[PDB]
Structures are given as structure tokens and as C-alpha cells.
Write a protein that binds this ligand. Structure first.
Ligand SMILES: CSC[C@H]1O[C@@H](n2cnc3c2N=CNC[C@H]3O)[C@H](O)[C@@H]1O
Ligand SMILES: [Zn+2]
Length: 357
């Protein structure tokens, strides 16, 4: 099915001749390596509404109202308002069946979008808390859902998992999450922190234990523009010794951090639309990915939470092309960096490079 663009062919495409719908056929055929996407918040509008109606969760609400009430598609005030609506959305984590269904839906849609390498991340405590589910059984449902789809797809998309410890919901427990990550070392390729952006320095020992056991780190940092300084970024880099940074857009505010990230070969996982919708960037026109890219910082393109925003990865490419003048060449380059920085087994990484790059 998917006829992926090859580096050789990029000179033959003239995007300026195409309508938006048309450019979408081009974005889909970019062989995409996506590093930053929350599985637990990865769904289409049709899937989300089906889940609400399945459990008769909002019988007083029309479809439009459900989406408005639960999601962030029209954006909101801050990372802070985001966390509060994420909590409502956990209304869908009703049982292990819907969770396995979600994993299947999410993998299948990434495949249809032209994603070839997909690292999903999820927070066990976030999925479990609402209906007090068992995290072992949650993780089994997700694993089984993923394996079913990839095998059905004759492994045309390669998928791995990262574990998230988080801050912001009632059952949040970073240590529990790290222990769980290590117990399932076999399934998890990385460990992350999300939710409220805190300075993770105070969890140094937990992150050192994870990292030293052989599980690399990529934490959310340098996202929230309401924080008074860049302490969280310094801690991620110097204390947690991360290999990648979720967002990292505030690196753009500091010449010293730009130098440090280049010097340390750290990649920033940029989620452009997420940044605009949470007001961490004024507009796509002024998004720091442009400045970061031009300064020599390694960056990749990510969707973050397709369910909360009601977008998919190809929306992010469209925005980058349209508002910030990125080229097909840039996109192939960012995707190869992302493959290079991926936490997946290197044999798998070799195949993908052979196949697409
Ligand atoms: C404490 S609830 C917020 C939850 O939603 C997750 N999250 C989803 N999208 C993002 C999240 N966390 C932090 N920054 C905003 C965005 O990247 C986070 O991992 C956490 O699991
Ligand atoms: Zn994220």
C-alpha cells in the first residue's frame, strides 16, 4: 500500500502546486519516525465518542458537547488546564477491553498516517486510577493490542513502549512507576516524566536507578512557559542525563542551553501543535522549532496527544510547511535523526534505515 518517498525523489515534488488535501498525500508518504506520542491520549474523535456512548457516560450530551467537555481541540489556558481535562478523559479507562481496543486503534491509525517507527508512551498510574484497575493487567492489554495489529500488518510499522511516571493526578507515584518500568524492562525502551513540569532533581536517585539499569531517559522539560526560570531543563540535562527531551522548546531562550544540547547530542522531541494549543508558543509562525533547527539543534516532529487535540502527525507537518517554510528535505532529515536517536533495538533500527533512508 504506502508508497514512501525516497531521498532521491524529493527533488521531483513541487509542494507549491498542491492543495492542502493534496499536500496531505505527500505528508503521509514521508516515512515517519515518531518519538513523542501518549498512547493513553491517542484516539480519533469517532473512537472517543464511541467509548463515551459505549459506557453511557454522557447521556445528556450531544457529540459536539462531549468533545468540548472532555478534550482540548480548541486549546486552553495552559499545561495546567490540560492536566485537568486529561483527568476527565480517564472516564474512558473503564475496563481492560477498551484499553486493548485503544492500543489497536492507535497503532492502526499511525500506520495509515505513514509512520514506520513509533515509540508510544503511557502512564500506568494515569490509566488505572479512575476505575482502580490493575496496572499489570493494563500493561498486558496494551501489549497484546499492539502485537495483534503489528502482526496483522506484517510488521509494516515497528512499535515500542515507554513508561511514564507523572505528576498531577491522584494516584501519581514516580517511584512505583520506575519499579514497574524495570520489572517490565523487556517491554519498555525508555522512562519518562509528564504531567506538571517539576524540577526532577529531587528524584535524582530514582532516575539514576532506572538509567543505570539500562533504560534511557527522555523527560518532558522546557515546555511550560509559565515557569520562572529554566531550572527543569538544566536538571533534565545535567542531573537526569537524558538522551532526549520532550518539547525542550525553551532551550531556544538560552544560548547556553542551545550549546549544551548540541554538544551533548541531545534531540528535542518537538510537538508543534501541542505547544500552540497549550499556549506554550504564541503561534505556529513564531514557534521556536525554526530557530532551534537553524541553530543546529537536532529536533524531530511529534503529535503528542492526537486524542486531546483531535489531530494526527500529518497535521504537524502541514503546519511546519505552511507557517514555518520547512521543506521535504528538512522532514527527511528530522526523521532520520529521530531514527538515530530512537530507543529501539539497533537491528530494528538498521532495517528501518535500509528500508526507508
Ligand atoms: C498528571 S495527568 C497529565 C497526563 O497526561 C500526559 N500528557 C499528555 N500530553 C502531555 C502530557 N504531559 C505533559 N505535558 C503536556 C503534553 O506533552 C502526562 O504524561 C500525564 O500522564
Ligand atoms: Zn507529551
Amino acid at each position: 500500500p504506502i508508497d514512501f518517498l525516497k531521498k532521491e525523489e524529493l527533488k521531483n515534488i513541487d509542494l507549491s502546486q498542491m492543495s492542502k488535501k493534496e499536500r496531505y498525500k505527500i505528508w503521509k508518504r514521508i516515512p515517519k519516525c515518531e518519538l513523542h506520542c501518549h498512547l493513553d491520549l491517542c484516539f480519533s474523535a469517532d473512537f472517543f465518542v464511541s467509548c463515551i456512548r459505549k459506557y453511557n457516560l454522557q447521556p445528556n450530551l450531544s457529540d459536539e458537547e462531549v468533545l468540548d467537555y472532555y478534550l482540548f481541540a480548541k486549546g486552553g489556558k495552559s499545561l495546567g488546564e490540560f492536566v485537568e481535562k486529561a483527568i476527565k478523559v480517564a472516564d474512558i479507562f473503564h475496563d481492560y477491553e477498551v484499553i486493548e481496543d485503544l492500543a489497536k486503534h492507535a497503532v492502526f491509525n499511525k500506520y495509515k498516517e505513514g509512520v514506520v517507527l513509533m515509540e508510544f508512551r503511557y502512564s500506568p498510574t494515569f490509566v488505572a486510577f479512575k476505575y482502580n484497575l490493575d496496572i499489570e493487567l493494563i500493561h498486558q492489554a496494551i501489549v497484546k493490542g499492539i502485537k495483534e495489529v503489528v502482526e496483522l500488518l506484517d510488521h509494516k510499522i515497528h512499535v515500542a513502549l515507554m513508561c511514564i511516571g507523572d505528576t498531577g493526578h491522584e494516584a501519581a507515584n514516580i517511584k512505583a512507576s520506575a519499579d514497574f518500568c524495570l520489572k517490565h524492562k523487556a517491554d519498555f525502551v525508555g522512562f519518562d516524566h509528564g504531567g506538571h513540569e517539576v524540577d526532577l532533581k529531587e528524584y535524582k536517585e530514582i532516575f539514576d536507578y532506572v538509567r543505570e539499569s539500562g533504560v534511557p531517559l527522555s523527560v518532558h522539560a522546557g515546555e511550560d512557559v509559565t515557569l520562572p526560570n529554566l531550572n527543569t531543563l538544566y536538571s533534565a540535562i545535567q542531573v537526569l542525563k537524558v538522551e532526549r527531551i520532550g518539547h525542550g522548546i525553551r532551550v531556544a531562550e538560552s544560548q547556553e542551553l542551545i550549546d549544551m544540547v548540541k554538544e551533548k547530542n541531545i534531540l528535542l522531541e518537538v510537538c508543534p501543535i501541542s505547544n500552540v494549543l497549550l499556549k506554550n508558543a504564541k503561534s505556529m509562525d513564531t514557534h521556536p522549532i525554526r530557530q532551534l533547527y537553524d541553530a543546529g539543534v537536532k529536533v524531530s516532529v511529534n503529535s503528542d496527544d492526537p486524542g486531546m487535540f483531535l489531530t494526527n502527525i500529518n497535521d504537524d507537518y502541514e503546519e511546519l510547511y505552511t507557517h514555518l517554510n520547512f521543506t521535504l528535505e528538512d522532514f527527511m532529515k528530522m526523521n532520520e535523526w529521530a531514527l538515530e536517536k530512537s530507543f529501539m533495538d539497533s537491528n530494528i533500527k538498521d532495517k528501518i534505515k535500509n528500508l526507508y533512508f
